[PDB]
Design a binder for this molecule. Structure first.
Ligand SMILES: *[C@@H]1O[C@H](CO)[C@@H](O[C@@H]2O[C@H](CO)[C@@H](O)[C@H](O)[C@H]2NC(C)=O)[C@H](O)[C@H]1NC(C)=O
Ligand SMILES: *[C@@H]1O[C@H](CO)[C@@H](O[C@@H]2O[C@H](CO)[C@@H](O)[C@H](O)[C@H]2NC(C)=O)[C@H](O)[C@H]1NC(C)=O
Ligand SMILES: *[C@@H]1O[C@H](CO)[C@@H](O[C@@H]2O[C@H](CO)[C@@H](O)[C@H](O)[C@H]2NC(C)=O)[C@H](O)[C@H]1NC(C)=O
Ligand SMILES: *[C@@H]1O[C@H](CO)[C@@H](O[C@@H]2O[C@H](CO)[C@@H](O)[C@H](O)[C@H]2NC(C)=O)[C@H](O)[C@H]1NC(C)=O
Ligand SMILES: *[C@@H]1O[C@H](CO)[C@@H](O[C@@H]2O[C@H](CO)[C@@H](O)[C@H](O)[C@H]2NC(C)=O)[C@H](O)[C@H]1NC(C)=O
Ligand SMILES: *[C@@H]1O[C@H](CO)[C@@H](O[C@@H]2O[C@H](CO)[C@@H](O)[C@H](O)[C@H]2NC(C)=O)[C@H](O)[C@H]1NC(C)=O
Ligand SMILES: *[C@@H]1O[C@H](CO)[C@@H](O)[C@H](O)[C@H]1NC(C)=O
Ligand SMILES: *[C@@H]1O[C@H](CO)[C@@H](O)[C@H](O)[C@H]1NC(C)=O
Ligand SMILES: *[C@@H]1O[C@H](CO)[C@@H](O)[C@H](O)[C@H]1NC(C)=O
Ligand SMILES: *[C@@H]1O[C@H](CO)[C@@H](O)[C@H](O)[C@H]1NC(C)=O
Ligand SMILES: *[C@@H]1O[C@H](CO)[C@@H](O)[C@H](O)[C@H]1NC(C)=O
Length: 646
């Protein structure tokens, strides 16, 4: 009507920063046949506006001059995705016909007025992504026809009103990302039509109401990242339409209720980061639909039940960081769909089962810091789908080249501190995307296959603390992405290859405790990320090359326990980031260069058991050094443990 159109024009005249490419260019002629046919966002019935849809039209303004008293037949209102600021007036509750009300994604502030509860015909209320604060008024519980309430991502405080139990037609309730507090009212459990209940990321406390067992149609229950406490009520097992139950990151205590096995529809169960204790009920194996079972970071004890072999759709099983113990039953890995088996930081014992990867789809197997032992099952040898294998801290045994097959998509493997023996196979080269190869402190013997240096995506290679023999070839330069190279504590012999000079991504190089002989390559001068170099405990000889002083990021340089001789270069002053320097147990002669006074970052120095003489340079490391950093030298003199200088 002319009066509705004139009133909307007056509201429009108040908008700011309007671009004249606005859709509202079409708001000109208030007569019908303009108003009801060509005004953007306006739809009428019998010449009167019943729908106002200005979503995402770049309006900046407020509702201060919104014409509440001029639009009596307003039925559908969508003002979302604009730049409306200010508050939500009580006058919005005078639109008696309103069915659909959306002010989301604006910059609205202040409290929700109780008058919204007067909208007795409302079907949908959306106020998401604003900065609304205060408590939800209890009068919202008068919206007896509403089927969806979404007020997520606001600044709401206070409890969820008990009056929400009167919202008998409510289907979806989305209140996540707020600061709602108090206990969940038990009246929520008596909403017969409820399908989705999302109260996650709030500050809710107290126990989950046992009334939730009356929620026979709820398919989604998200209440993660709250402060819920007490035990999960056994009545939850009567939510027999649940597809997804997420209670993670709460303060729940006591046992997992055995009645969860009653929920045959349940596909996703997230209970991690709680304080759940006791044994995993064997009835959890009856959750026939379960795909994604995550109960890590709890205080569960006892063994995993054999009934886990009945979970035939299982894909992800997260149990890390519990106190589970004992042997694992073959059923734990029996799902042909299993892709991730995550058991780290428990106290499991015995062998891996022969069911593992029987479906040919297992990807991530992580077992760190358990007590597993025995040989690798042949079905894991033959598991071509593996991406991540983490066995650190267990005691697996067997010949390493018999235990493992070929893994084309392997990305990361850590076998540190296991008990594997044998020689490395060239088969590892078929993991062309492998970025970390960690085999520290096994009983590996024999040579490094030359194919290893063709694993050009390697970023970490750690074969330390084995009994590996042979010489490093010049083609070591081919692992040109390597950033951490740890070959320490082996029996490698021959000269250190010059090709390491081309490993310009190297950050950390440990070749120590080997039998390397002859000179340190004089071309190691161009490793601009190298902060750690350890060549100690070898048989390296001749002079320390000046190229090492160009390794400007070095923080630690350890060349101790070699037969290096000649003088310490005064160009060491160039290592301005050097904190720790160990040259002890060598055959170095002459004076410690006075240029060490330039190295203000040095904190630790050891030159003991050399053939050095003369006074000690003036820097803090030398002043703070204990007598044994100097002992065993020829004629050092001081101004500790040294005779004073003349
Ligand atoms: C638009 O609103 C007007 C004003 O409320 C409605 O007109 C009234 O209709 C009632 C019927 O409930 C009549 O008895 C009155 O004579 C009208 N009042 C006035 C002040 O004109 C109109 O029906 C509404 N139109 C639509 C399509 O909802
Ligand atoms: C909701 O937000 C408003 C706006 O920041 C808060 O309003 C302030 O309230 C205090 C005390 O009630 C007054 O002293 C200020 O002058 C108010 N500021 C404005 C801009 O109105 C309001 O307190 C908040 N409500 C809650 C419960 O936090
Ligand atoms: C591994 O899973 C299979 C099913 O995928 C289990 O085999 C079924 O066992 C039940 C007995 O409870 C029989 O009624 C079915 O006929 C079996 N199906 C097939 C295809 O054999 C097997 O028991 C599971 N193994 C373990 C160790 O849990
Ligand atoms: C059972 O497993 C737990 C977790 O893996 C072990 O606890 C760790 O023990 C080491 C060594 O004492 C500590 O450095 C860690 O801080 C502990 N981690 C945690 C998360 O507590 C525990 O030692 C194991 N029990 C036995 C008998 O080995
Ligand atoms: C098994 O672990 C790997 C991590 O190494 C997962 O792969 C990564 O997934 C993210 C997506 O979340 C991708 O952006 C990365 O590119 C993937 N990395 C690699 C190396 O592929 C993989 O999704 C896990 N498997 C399952 C079923 O969760
Ligand atoms: C360089 O590596 C050697 C091992 O090859 C580290 O040696 C340790 O040194 C301390 C004191 O010198 C001894 O108490 C340890 O017993 C040594 N360990 C071994 C396994 O021999 C040395 O610490 C490393 N240097 C730096 C700076 O990290
Ligand atoms: C106009 O727009 C800019 C940013 O959109 C803002 O700084 C200014 O406050 C706006 N309106 C005014 C000053 O009325
Ligand atoms: C408003 O228009 C958008 C885009 O056409 C549409 O997706 C939305 O459902 C409309 N809302 C109403 C209440 O008409
Ligand atoms: C709505 O709930 C309140 C308690 O919050 C109750 O007093 C009232 O009677 C309920 N509604 C009806 C129609 O009774
Ligand atoms: C689990 O927690 C309760 C206290 O909340 C305690 O009574 C019980 O002994 C705990 N330990 C178990 C069940 O092993
Ligand atoms: C491997 O190192 C661990 C500590 O990391 C040590 O306790 C263990 O004895 C080493 N391996 C063997 C076989 O001794």
């Amino acid at each position: 009507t002319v009066e509705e159109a004139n009133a909307l024009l007056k509201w429009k005249s108040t908008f700011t920063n309007q671009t004249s490419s606005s859709k509202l260019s079409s708001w000109v002629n208030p007569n019908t046949s303009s108003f009801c046919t060509s005004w953007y966002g306006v739809a009428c019935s019998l010449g009167s506006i019943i729908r106002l849809n200005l979503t995402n039209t770049g309006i900046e303004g407020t509702f201060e001059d919104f014409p509440f008293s001029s639009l009596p037949n307003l039925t559908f209102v969508d003002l979302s995705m604009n730049r409306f600021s200010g508050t939500i007036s009580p006058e919005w509750g005078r639109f008696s016909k309103l069915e659909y009300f959306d002010l989301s994604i604006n910059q609205l502030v202040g409290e929700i007025p109780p008058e919204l509860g007067k909208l007795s015909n409302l079907d949908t209320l959306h106020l998401v992504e604003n900065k609304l604060n205060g408590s939800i008024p209890s009068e919202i519980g008068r919206l007896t026809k509403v089927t969806e309430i979404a007020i997520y991502d606001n600044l709401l405080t206070g409890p969820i009103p008990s009056s929400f139990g009167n919202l008998t037609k409510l289907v979806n309730l989305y209140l996540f990302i707020n600061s709602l507090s108090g206990s969940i009212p038990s009246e929520i459990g008596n909403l017969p039509n409820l399908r989705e209940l999302c109260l996650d990321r709030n500050n809710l406390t107290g126990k989950i109401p046992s009334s939730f067992g009356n929620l026979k149609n709820v398919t989604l229950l998200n209440m993660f990242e709250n402060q819920l406490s007490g035990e999960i009520p056994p009545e939850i097992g009567n939510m027999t339409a649940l597809d997804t139950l997420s209670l993670h990151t709460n303060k729940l205590t006591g046992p997992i209720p055995s009645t969860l096995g009653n929920i045959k529809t349940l596909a996703v169960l997230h209970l991690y980061l709680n304080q759940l204790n006791g044994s995993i009920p064997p009835e959890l194996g009856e959750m026939e639909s379960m795909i994604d079972l995550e109960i890590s970071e709890n205080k569960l004890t006892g063994p995993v039940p054999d009934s886990f072999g009945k979970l035939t759709a299982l894909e992800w099983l997260f149990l890390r960081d519990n106190q589970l113990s004992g042997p694992i039953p073959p059923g734990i890995a029996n799902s042909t769909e299993l892709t991730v088996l995550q058991l780290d930081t428990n106290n499991f014992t015995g062998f891996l089962p022969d069911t593992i990867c029987r479906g040919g789809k297992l990807e991530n197997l992580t077992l760190d810091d358990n007590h597993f032992e025995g040989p690798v099952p042949k079905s894991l040898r033959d598991c071509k789908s593996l991406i991540r294998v983490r066995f650190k801290g267990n005691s697996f045994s067997g010949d390493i080249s018999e235990a493992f097959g070929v893994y084309p998509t392997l990305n990361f493997i850590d076998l540190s501190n296991n008990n594997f023996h044998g020689q490395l196979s060239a088969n590892w080269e078929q993991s062309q995307k492998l970025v970390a190869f960690i085999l520290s402190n096994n009983s590996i013997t024999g040579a490094i296959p030359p194919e290893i240096w063709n694993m050009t995506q390697l970023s970490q290679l750690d074969l330390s603390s084995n009994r590996i023999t042979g010489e490093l070839p010049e083609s070591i330069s081919n692992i040109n992405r390597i950033s951490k190279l740890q070959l320490n504590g082996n029996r490698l012999s021959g000269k250190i290859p010059s090709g390491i000079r081309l490993l310009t991504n190297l950050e950390y190089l440990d070749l120590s405790s080997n039998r390397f002989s002859f000179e340190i390559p004089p071309t190691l001068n161009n490793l601009p990320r190298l902060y750690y170099m350890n060549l100690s405990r070898n048989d390296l000889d001749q002079t320390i090359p000046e190229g090492l002083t160009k390794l400007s990021q070095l923080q630690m340089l350890d060349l101790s326990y070699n037969q290096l001789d000649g003088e310490i270069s005064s160009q060491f002053r160039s290592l301005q980031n050097l904190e720790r320097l160990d040259l002890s147990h060598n055959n170095l002669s002459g004076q410690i260069p006075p240029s060490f006074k330039d190295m203000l970052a040095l904190t630790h120095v050891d030159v003991s058991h050399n053939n050095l003489q003369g006074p000690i340079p003036d820097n803090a490391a030398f002043r703070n050094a204990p007598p044994d950093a100097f002992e065993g030298n020829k004629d050092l003199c001081g101004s500790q443990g040294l005779k004073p200088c003349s």
